[PDB]
Every structure is written in C-alpha cells, then in structure tokens.
Amino acid sequence: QQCVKKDELCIPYYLDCCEPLECKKVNWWDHKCIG
C-alpha cells in the first residue's frame, strides 16, 4: 500500500494523510499536509 504524511500532498477524496498529520489545500493548483 501507500501512505502520505508530513510535507506530503493533501488528498481529501478518500484518504486523509496519516496522523497526527492532516490534509488541506495550499492552493487550487496545489495540495499539502499540515502537522
């Protein structure tokens, strides 16, 4: 499988980065995790 956390790329479709990291939009042409 594949995961996605920390300086990764947010993806809300059906995922949500690992924890305690999050997933949000830095721009409409962009995506990024949080913390």
Token couple for 33: 């995790």
23/34 Cα distance (integer angstroms): 6
13/10 Cα distance (integer angstroms): 9
Cis peptide before 20 (omega within 30 of 0): yes
Helix then strand then coil, in percent of the chain rounded to 5, is: 0, 5, 95
Tokens 């995922």, residue?
A: 15
Contact 24, 8 (CB under 8 A): no
Name the structure determination technique.
NMR
Contact 5, 18 (CB under 8 A): yes
Cα atoms in the Cβ-side hemisphere of radius 13 Å centred on 32: 9
35: closest CA among 23, 21, 24? 21
